[model samples]
Target: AFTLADRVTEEMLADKAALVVEVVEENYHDAPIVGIAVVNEHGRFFLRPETALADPQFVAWLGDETKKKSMFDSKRAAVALKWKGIELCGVSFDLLLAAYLLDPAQGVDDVAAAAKMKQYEAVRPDEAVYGKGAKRAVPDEPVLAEHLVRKAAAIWALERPFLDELRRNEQDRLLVELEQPLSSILAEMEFAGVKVDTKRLEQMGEELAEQLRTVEQRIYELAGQEFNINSPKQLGVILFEKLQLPVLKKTKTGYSTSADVLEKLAPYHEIVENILHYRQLGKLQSTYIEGLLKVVRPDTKKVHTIFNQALTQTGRLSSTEPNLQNIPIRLEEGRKIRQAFVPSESDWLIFAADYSQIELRVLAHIAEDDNLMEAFRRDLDIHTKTAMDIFQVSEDEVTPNMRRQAKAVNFGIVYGISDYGLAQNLNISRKEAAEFIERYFESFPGVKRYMENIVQEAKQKGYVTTLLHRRRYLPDITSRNFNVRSFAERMAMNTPIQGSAADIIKKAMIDLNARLKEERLQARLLLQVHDELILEAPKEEMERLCRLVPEVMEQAVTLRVPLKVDYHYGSTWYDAK
Candidate 1:
C-alpha cells in the first residue's frame, strides 16, 4: 500500500497524479516539517528531507499553481513551508475545511476523525501511533511512513464524500470561496506576525506591579492583617467572617469569592474595592505583560498567534497561543497593554478598521424591522433611538441612563437573553426586564416576528444557516425538556445573526487582502480581533489604505441597511484606538 521514496522526482509529480499530501511537523507551534507523505491512485509515497530541508523538486511542485493537491489543514502546511522560505500553492482541496463546513461542531482536524465521520475508518488516530505527552516523537522510518501514508489515504478517501456533502448542504461556495481563500490569507498573516514593544510591556509590568502593591497594602490595612490575596479561600474568610460582608452565595468548599460576589461587596467595604483592584493589576501583570513577553521571538520581536479557523461553530475565527482576542479594552490598565503592539517597520503605523454596530446592523437587515433599519439609515445613534421608542420619549428627552438600558436591550435581544438574563445585565427586576423587552418588541414588531419565525424554521429543518450558507444544526430545538429546548431556541434565533456577521467580516478580509495585493500596497494585515481588522502600512500609503479598506469592507455584501466601518491609525495599537 505504500512506497518510501529516497527523493521526490518529476515522474512522481506528474500532472495526471492528483496527490493527497500531509506533513509531519516537529511540533505544533510554527515548527519545521519532519517529513511529508503523499497518496495517489498509483501508490502511497513518503519523503523525509535528508538535511532538514525540503527537496528542491518537492518545493517547486508545492509552489507550482498548475499542480493540484489535496490535504487536511493545508494552512498549517503552508505556514510551515513559509518558515522554510517556500510558498505552498496548488492546494485544490482541504479536507479540514470541507469537514468543518459540513459539521462545524465536531473536532475535524485529525484525518482519522474526518474519515470516520464519512464512515471510512481506515486511519488510526495519530496519538495511537506517536504516543502521547512526553513520549510523543517521530518513530522509526517504517512506522512513521505507515502512519503518514494512512493519514494521506484517509484524506484521499474522504475528499469526494466531503465535497458531495458540502454541495448537498449548499455550502460548497462557502468552502471554496470563503474558507479556502481565507486559510491562505491567515497563513500569511500568521507568518508575517505582529511586532511587539518588549520595552513598553516591561515598563507597563513594573507600573502594574507598583499598583498591585499599593492596592494590596490598602486591602491589608483595611483587613488589619495581610493574607494570601490570591487564595480564594483565605479572601473569602476575610470578607465573609472577619470583615462581616453579607454572603451572596456559597460554593461546595466555601463562600463564593468570584468577581460578581466581590463586585456586590464593593459597596459594603472599602477593602473589597482594593481587593478587586489588586486582582485586576495582578492579571494585567501576569497575563498581558509576562504572557506576551514570553512568546515574543527575541530576534524578531514579534508574536505569531495561530488562528483557529475551524473551531467555532458560527464561522468566527479565534486566536490562540496567547489568545489575542481576549485582550481587555474596557479598563485603562488593560487598554494600555495595546501600547506594546507596534508596527514592525520604523516609519509604518498600525491601522485599525472596525465595523460600527455591525451586529445591530445585521439584526436590522435580517429582521427587516423598519424602525431599526430607519434609525441606521438616518444615521442616528441606535441606542438613543431605542431609548426614545421604548420609553415613549422624544429623541431630545432621552437620558443617559435610558440610552444605557436601551443599549443593553439591543445587545440582549441579539444574544437571545431571557428576562432573567437581561435583569442580571441591567441590574433590574425580572418583571422590569420583561416589560422592557415587551416594549422593545412592541416598538419593533418585525424583529419579534423574525425571532419566532427563525425558531419555527429551525424546528422544521433542524438547522439554521447564515447569509453565506454557513450552517449550524440545532438538534435540541425539538427537545422535550424546558431548559434544553429554550437553549436551542436561543441558538436558533442567534446563530444566523452572529454567523452572518462572521461571514461579512470574513468576506471583508478576503476582499481587503485581494485589494491590497491588487493595489500593490506594502501594507500587510496583522490581526483580526472580532469586528476589527488590524494592519500596518508605510506612512505614505496611509491615505490610500484609509479610503480603500472601508470601501472594500462596506461593499463586502449588500443588504437593506448599509454596512458601516470606523477606522483609526497611530504609532501603536492603543494610540490607534
Candidate 2:
C-alpha cells in the first residue's frame, strides 16, 4: 500500500493509475472471506499512526489508549468504509438501482451487458449491436499493466454487494419476486437442462436450407429471374418495377417493400403474394432452421439456455439471440423449432411451472382493484371479466374474440399503450381502440389511477419501480422528443406491474427449490422461459413436484391476490402442455 505513493504522483495517478488499480483489482471479495481492520492507540482514532492514509494530515483523531474497540467494532467501521468506497466508484447508484428495476432476474454479466448496450433507444430499422472483434494490443510489461489490474479488482470487489444484496434482500420486491426466481428457475432449467436432438436438428437445418432453396427458386420464377430476394435492394426492384405493385408507403429510395405494404398489395398482385410467401419461408429458414443450429451445446449436444434476471428494467425476462422464451407452440411450422429441444440421454420427462395472468393479478394486488381481485379470487377468465365489465355483457355472452380483445386491452394498459397501438394490433380504427381503452379504465378505475400515479411519480423522480421495488430509469421522461417521451410513459406503466410479477414468481421458485431439496426429491430444474420454470425429473418425482411447485409459489409471498402457478409434466418439452 505504501509503495503505491513512491512510484505514482497525483498527476501520474490520473494519467497512469494502472499500478494502484492492479493491486486493488485482484484483492476483491474473490478471497474466501474478506475483512477490514483498523488499528489505533486512541480508542476513537480512524487510522493507525505508522500508515499513510494517502494524506499527510493527522486525519486520525486523538485516542485515549484505554477502552479499545473490539474486533466486531473495527470490522463494522471498516466494512462501512468499504461500502462508502463502492459508492465513490465509476458506476452511479442510479444505474444499479435502474438495473434492478428493469430486470431483477439478472446478475453481473447482465449489468456489464446493460452498460454496453444503448439505454434509451427506440426500435430502429438499421440498428445493430456494436460488435467488438478480438483484435487488440496487449502490453508485455507487468508493471505498466498494473493500473488496469488494480482497478478491475477494486471494481469487482465493490460490485459484489450489488449481486449479493439482490440475492439477500427482499427490499426490491422485483428482484426477489421476479428477477431472482426467474434467474434461479433458469439456472435450474439449464442445470438439469433439455437435450437437443442434435442429429435431428442438424438434419432439419439441412432440410430447411434445401426447402428454402427450392422455394427461393420457385419465387424467382414467379417474380422474374434469378435475383437475391434476401436483399432489400433486389426485392425492391422486383416488387416495384417487375411486379408494378402500387406503392403503399414511402421509403428513402422509393417504394417500401415492407410487410405492411406487401400485405396490402397482396390483394392486387400475384407477385406480392409470392413475395409474402417467400418472406415467410425466409423467416423460417433463418430464425428456426439456421438460428437454432447455432444454440446447440457441444458436450450435452442440447440447448442449455439460461434466463437473465436483470436484463429488463421493467422486470420482465428477455431471451437472447437463440431465445428460448418465444419458442413457437401455436404454429405447426413454428413448432418444428421445439423439435430440437429434446430430452437428454436419460429420456427424462420435462416439467413446466407457469403463472396464469400473473401480471393482471399483480395489478390487482398493487392497485387494490376490487374487480381484478374478485376475478382472481373467483378464478374467472380475467379478460372475459374485463370484457363483461367494460362491454357490460353477461359472463355467458362474452365471445372468445371479445375476451381476446379485452385481454389485449388489460395487458396493453400496463405498458401505457396508445389508442393507435391498440387499433393497429386489433385491426380496428383509432376511435374504436380509444373507446376500448376508455371503457376499460371506466370499468377498472383503480388500474387507471395506478398507471397515472406511476407516470407522475416517475416524472417527479426520474425512475419507476416494480411492485417488488425493481426500478427502471426513464431519463427521457423529461425529454422534449415525442418518441422518447412515449416510450418512457410506457415503461413507467409497465415496470411496477411486470417487475412485481417477476419478483413474486422468483420468491416462489426459490422457496420451491429449497423445499424440493428438503424433501430429497430428484426432480431437477430444466428450463426457465421467462415466467415458466421447466423441470426434468425422474418420472417418479412428477406427482410430488406438481403439488409442491404450485404450493410454494402461491404461498411464497403474500399479496392481495394469490400468487398462483400452473404446471404440467410430459415426456418431451412439447409434451408438457
Candidate 3:
C-alpha cells in the first residue's frame, strides 16, 4: 500500500495530484520534523526528514499555492515547516476543522479520533501506536513508515466525507471561508512569536516575592501564629477554628476555604484580605513571572504560544503552553506581566484595538431592541442610558452606584443571569435583584421577547446557532430536571450572542490580515486577547495603522446598531493599554 522513497521524482510532485500530507514531529513546538508522508491517487509514499529537506522539487511542491493539499491540523504542519525555514501553502482542506464544525464535542484532535468519528477505522491513535505516557517512544523505520502511511491514507479517505457533511450542515462557509484561512494566519502568528524581556520579568518576580512575603507576615500576625500558608488545610484551621470565623461551606476533608467563601468572610477578619492578597501575589510570581521565564527561548527571547483553534465550543480561540487568555488585568501586579512582551524590532510600537461593548451591541442587533439600538446609534454611554431608563432618572440625576448596577444588569442579561445569580453579584437580596431585572426587561421588552423565543427555538430544534451558522446543540433543553433545563435554556440565550461576538472578531482578523497585505504594511498581528487585537509595526507605519486597524475592525460585520472600536499604541504591551 505504500513505498518508502529516498527521493521523489517530478512526476510524483505534479499539480494533477491532490496531495494528502502529514508531518511527524519530535515535539509539537520548536522541534524537528522526523517524517513526511504524502498520499494521492497515484500512490502512497514516505520520505525521511532529510530527503524532503534535500529535494528541491518536493520543497517547491510544498510551497506552490495552485496545488491542492489536505491535512489534519494543517496549522501544526505549517508551524513545523516554518521552524524548518520552509513555507507551507496550498492547503485546500483540513479534516480536523471540518470535524469540529460538524460536531465540536467529539474530542477529535488526531487522525485516529477523526477517523473514528467519521467511521473510517483503519488507523490506530498515536497513543496506542507509541505506547502511553513515559513508555512512549518512536519505533524503528518500518513500523514508523506503516504508522505514517496509515494516517495519510485515513486523511485521504475522510476528506470528501467531512466536506460533504459540512455542506449538509451549511457550515462549508464557516470551514473553508473562515477557519481554513485563519489557520494559516494563526500559524504565521505562532511562528512569529511574541518577544519577551527576561530582565523585566525577573524584576517583576522579585517585587512579587517581596509583596507575597509582606502579605504572608500580615496574615500570620492576624492569625496570631505562623503556619504553612500554602496548605489549604492549615489555612482552613486558622480561619475557621483558630480565628472563629463562620464557616460558610465545608468540604469532605475540612472547611471550605475557597476564594468565594473567604470573600464573604472578608468583613469579619483583616486576615482574609491579607490571605487574598498573598494568593494573588503568589500566582503572579509563579505563573506569570517564573512560568513565562521558563518558556522564553534562549535563542529568540520569545514565547511561542499555540492557539487551539478547535477547542472552544463558542468559536472562541484559546491559547495553551502557558495560557495567555486568563491573565488578570484587575490587579496592577498581574497587568505588569504584559510589560515583558515587547516588539521584536527596535523603534517599533505595540498597537491595540478592541471593540467597545461588542456583546451588548450584538445583543441589541439580535434582539432588535429599539432602546438598546437607539443608545448605540446615538453613541450614548450604554450603562448611563440603562440607568436612566430603568431607574426613571435623568442622566444628570443618575448616581455612580446607579450606573454600576445598570452595568451589571446589562452584562447579566447577556449571560442569562438568574435573580439568585444577580443577587450574589450585587450583594443584595434576591427580591431586589428580581425587581431590577423586571425593570430592565420592562425598559427593553424586545430583549425579553428574544430570550424567550431563543429558548423555545432551541427546544424545538435541539440546537442554537450563531450569526455565522456555528451551531451549538442543547440536548438538555427538554430535560425533566429543572437545574439541567435551566442551564440549557441559559446556554440557548447566550450562545448566539457570545458566539456572534467571536464570529465578528474572527472576521476582523481575516479582514485585517488582507488589508495589511494590500497596503504593503510591515504591521503584524501578534495577539488576540478576547475582544482586542495586539499588533506590532515599524514606527513609519504607525500613522496608517492607527486609522487602518479600527476602520477594518468596526466594519468586519454589519449590524442594525453600529460597531465601534477603541485603539491605543505604546512602546510595550503594558503601555499600549
Candidate 4:
C-alpha cells in the first residue's frame, strides 16, 4: 500500500531537485533509470519496521518452490559471508560496504559501535558473537540465524542513516547517482568478459617457450661458455670475473643483476643483453602465458577478472583472479599477449576507445597551466609541444631525441617518477633528469606552482582530493624519512591528476553502458585497460559504434580543457589499438 506524508514540499523538492537531476543526468547521460531512491519533498517513507524481508527463513523458504530451498541465487543476496554464519544466502558485502561508508574521521575499532553514534540499532561485536582464534567454529544454525537477523535488520535501519551521512558530506549524489548504478553495469561487463581464443593463447605460450629456449642458447653463446644464467651467484662470477663487465651498481647480496643494473650493462656485453631478454621472456612465460592459461575458464574460454572497488588506496579500480589489468604492452612480446583477445563471434570486431593523453589533460585542467592547456586546446602533440617549449626550440627544430626525452618527462610527471627513477628510465644521469624537470617546471610555471601548492596543502591536511572529491590520506607526508616524505609529496602532486582521470573513465563506462542499453545496440563493453575501453560489436554496427564510443566517452566528464577520446576497431584487441 502507498503512504503519503509531507516534510519538504513539492516546492522544496523541485528546488533541491536541480542538483540531483543535474548530477544524475550528467553521470547517466540522461538515460532511463535502472534504479533510484526518490527522496522528494512530499513522498512517504513507508518501509515496514518489522519487515519479514529481513527474516532468514523468509528468504530460504522462497528460495525454492518445488524442491528443498537453497539459501542463495543470483538475484537476491544475504549477509551470510561477513557474519561468518551458516552459508544461508549468496555472498553480498552490502553490510561491509555500508560499514566502509562510515566517515573516515569517525574511524572506530568496533564495527557494531561504528554506527552506534549515528543512532542505529545496536549490533553485536562480531568476535563476541562469532568467537575468535581457537574458539572459532561454525555457530549453531539458530545462533547464526539470529545474528544475521539482527545485522540485516540493523542494515535496514541504518539505510536512512547511510543516506543522511552521504547527504551530510554532500556525496549523496556520488553514492546514489554514480556508485549505485555503476555497480550492476560493472557486473554485467565482468560477466560478459572478453573472449580469448584458447588455441591462439596456447600457441602464444608455446611460441614464448620456444623463443625463451633460443634466448637461453644465445646467452650461453654470448657468454663464450655456458653457466647458470638464472643464478645470480653464477651470473655474477661469469660477468665480473670471466667476462669482466663494468660494475654499474652493487646490491647487498652481490653485483646487482636487477633490470636496472643490467639495463645499463647491456651496451657493454652481448651476454648482458641476451640475459635481459631471457629474464623478460621467462617472466612472460611464468606470469602471463602460464598464469593466463590457468585462469581462463574452461566453460567460457574467457577471463572474468573481479574488479575490486576498495582494494586500491586511490579510487582507481584494481582487478584480480589473474589480474587482466596487469597485462603489459611495452615490449613486442608483451604486446603479443593481447592478440589472443578476439571477438566472441567470428564476424564481430573488438573496438577500443582510448582517452588520448587523459592524465596530462587532467593535470592541465587541475593545475590550470596556461601553456599546457593551450597545447591541448590547440590539439598539438603534447610531448612535442613540451619539447618545443622546454628546449626553447620551434616545432621543426625539436629533435627526435628531444621529443623522446620530453615524452619521458611528461610520463614522469604523471606517475610522480623521482628524478633518480627518471634518470634510470632514460639511461641518463640524475643531474640531466633534474635539469629536464627544472626546465619543464620553467616552461609550465603553473604546473610547478600547482605541484608545490598541492604538496603543501596535503602536508597541512594529511590528504589530497580528486575532482570528484575522492580522497587519499597521506599520513607520512610529514614523515622524518626523506624517501617516505618525498614519495608522499609526489603522491600529493599526482593522485588528483591520476585519480581524476580514473573518475572520468569510470563515469564514461557508466554513461556508455546506459547509452548502449538505451539504443538497444548490438555493441557491448568487454574490457577496461587503464585509460582504454574495449567493446565487442557486430561488423554491421561498426560504423555507428565508431562514432558512438568517442561521443559518449568525450562527454563523460567536463574539465577545463575538453576530454578527447580516440577509437579504433579490428578483428582482435591487438589490432583494434
Model 1 lDDT-worst window of ten:
15-24
Give candidate 4's TM-score: 0.77
List candidate 4 segments past 4 Å from native: 1-165, 220-244, 252-254
Q: Which lDDT tens digits does candidate 3 get at residues 433-469?
A: 9899889999999999999999999999989999999
lDDT of 1 by residue, 381-446 (tens): 999999999999998899999999999998886677776788999988999999998999999998
In model 1, residue pairs whose N, Cα or C atoms come closer than 3 Å (at least 3 residues apart or on different chains), thus clashing, are none
**Candidate 2 vs. true structure, TM-score:** 0.73
lDDT values for all models: 0.86, 0.59, 0.86, 0.68
lDDT of 2 by residue, 93-135 (tens): 2223334444443442322433323332221111122122343
Off by over 4 Å in 3: 14-27, 251-253, 416-418
Alpha-carbon error at 375 in model 2, in Å?
1.8
Per-candidate TM-scores read 0.97, 0.73, 0.96, 0.77
**Over 4 Å off in model 2, which ranges?**
1-131, 136-148, 156-193, 251-255, 319-321
Ranking by lDDT: 3, 1, 4, 2
